[PDB]
Scaffold this active site. Structure first.
Site, PDB file in Angstrom:
ATOM      1  N   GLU A  54       0.874  -1.162   0.000  1.00 32.14           N
ATOM      2  CA  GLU A  54       0.000   0.000   0.000  1.00 32.14           C
ATOM      3  C   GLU A  54       0.910   1.210   0.000  1.00 32.14           C
ATOM      4  O   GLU A  54       1.946   1.187   0.664  1.00 32.14           O
ATOM      5  CB  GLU A  54      -0.844   0.095   1.271  1.00 32.14           C
ATOM      6  CG  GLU A  54      -1.828  -1.095   1.566  1.00 32.14           C
ATOM      7  CD  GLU A  54      -3.142  -0.678   2.278  1.00 32.14           C
ATOM      8  OE1 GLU A  54      -3.263   0.510   2.634  1.00 32.14           O
ATOM      9  OE2 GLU A  54      -4.054  -1.524   2.460  1.00 32.14           O
ATOM     10  N   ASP A  86       7.422  -5.220 -15.506  1.00 34.25           N
ATOM     11  CA  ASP A  86       6.076  -4.701 -15.307  1.00 34.25           C
ATOM     12  C   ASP A  86       5.982  -3.296 -15.890  1.00 34.25           C
ATOM     13  O   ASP A  86       5.385  -2.398 -15.279  1.00 34.25           O
ATOM     14  CB  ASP A  86       5.664  -4.759 -13.829  1.00 34.25           C
ATOM     15  CG  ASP A  86       4.181  -4.631 -13.615  1.00 34.25           C
ATOM     16  OD1 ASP A  86       3.387  -4.847 -14.561  1.00 34.25           O
ATOM     17  OD2 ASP A  86       3.817  -4.295 -12.467  1.00 34.25           O
TER      18      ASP A  86
END
Ligand SMILES: Clc1nc2nn[nH]c2cc1Br
Ligand SMILES: [Cl-]
EC number: 2.7.11.1
Length: 328
Positions: free
Chosen positions: A47, A151
């Site tokens: 997060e 990614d």
């Protein structure tokens, strides 16, 4: 099998401690120096918050890691430390822990990102060249440091369009390249997965990132974002084959002795290779040039080993206007 055309041996030529991330022992500072201000984002492993360092008033980003994944934590930390100072790589300021729970977190430099969905509909021809050149600097750097990002996608390319600053973020899937190593194909976002991943070819390399970059380039010059919009991993390859061609796919598979999951037989169909000019229309014509198309054609290739390297891409005529402005 297959090897990278560049940077193939660079980890083997370094000290083992450079790439042996499982042996890395980070130095964990104190997260109590940071005040969380706003949640930015959240994934299955982390997060992310805007924060302030209360000791010096610096605005930063804090990424809180899920602590059970100790090997992956060490991997991301060691990669970011090895990349420190690289051009357009997000700067890791510190590695910290909650001093009671011991939950680890990464502290990054702050960047004020312009939402990509809106941005990619207003870029000029020069802007696309400029930002793609800046992203290539980051990829050439990490590849030269023996690291595949794995990614690359718009959400991981922060762009401050006011200061013209770009940073490649989220190194949580990145890995060290070692020749002949077989890697997990469950990397990258669906829309940015290279054909090698979609056909379960594990002996891939830095060139995977160049496929993903090509997908981003196509989306920018053609204003179709994402460019290849599969509904699942099977359909993703079908979407690619409808552009690059099915006979051409089979030639790639044959070259690398790749076995195709038989579910593909009922969905791939038969498709000719399409001309890249087919994607031009009145809404994108001002972003497309012969140079752009030549570069794109050399990135969005099935054969990973024939795609341009990040350096070869940077050296393409498409970027000459950027290089010239950079020196004048
Ligand atoms: Cl905003 C942000 N998010 C990230 N996720 N992984 N690394 C990151 C760095 C920054 Br800065
Ligand atoms: Cl892997």
């Amino acid at each position: 099998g297959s090897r990278a055309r560049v940077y193939a041996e660079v980890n083997s030529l370094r000290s083992r401690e450079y790439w042996d991330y499982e042996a890395h022992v980070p130095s964990w500072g104190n997260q109590d120096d940071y005040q969380l201000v706003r949640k930015l984002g959240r994934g299955k492993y982390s997060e992310v918050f805007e924060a302030i360092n209360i000791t010096n008033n610096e605005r930063v980003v804090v990424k809180i890691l899920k602590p059970v994944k100790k090997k992956k934590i060490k991997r991301e930390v060691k990669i970011l430390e090895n990349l420190r100072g690289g051009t357009n790589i997000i700067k890791l300021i510190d590695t910290v822990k909650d001093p009671v729970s011991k939950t680890p977190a990464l502290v990054f430099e702050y960047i004020n990102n312009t939402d990509f969905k809106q941005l990619y509909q207003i870029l000029t021809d020069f802007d696309i060249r400029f930002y793609m050149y800046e992203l290539l600097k980051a990829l050439d750097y990490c590849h030269s440091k023996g690291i595949m990002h794995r990614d690359v996608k718009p959400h991981n390319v922060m762009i401050d369009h006011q200061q013209k600053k770009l940073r490649l973020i989220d190194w949580g899937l990145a890995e060290f390249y070692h020749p002949a190593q077989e890697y997990n194909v469950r990397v990258a976002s669906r829309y940015f997965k290279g054909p090698e991943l979609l056909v379960d070819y594990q002996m891939y390399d830095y060139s995977l990132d160049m496929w993903s970059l090509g997908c981003m380039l196509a989306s920018m010059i053609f204003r179709r974002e994402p460019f290849f919009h599969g509904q699942d991993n099977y359909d993703q390859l079908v979407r690619i084959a409808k552009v690059l061609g099915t006979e051409e796919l089979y030639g790639y598979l044959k070259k690398y002795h790749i076995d195709l999951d038989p579910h593909f037989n009922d969905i791939l169909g038969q498709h000719s290779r399409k001309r890249w000019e087919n994607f031009i229309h009145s809404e994108n014509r001002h972003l497309v040039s012969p140079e752009a198309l030549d570069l794109l054609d050399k990135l969005l290739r099935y054969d990973h080993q024939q795609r341009l390297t990040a350096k070869e891409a940077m050296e393409h005529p498409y970027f000459y206007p950027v290089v010239k402005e950079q020196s004048q």
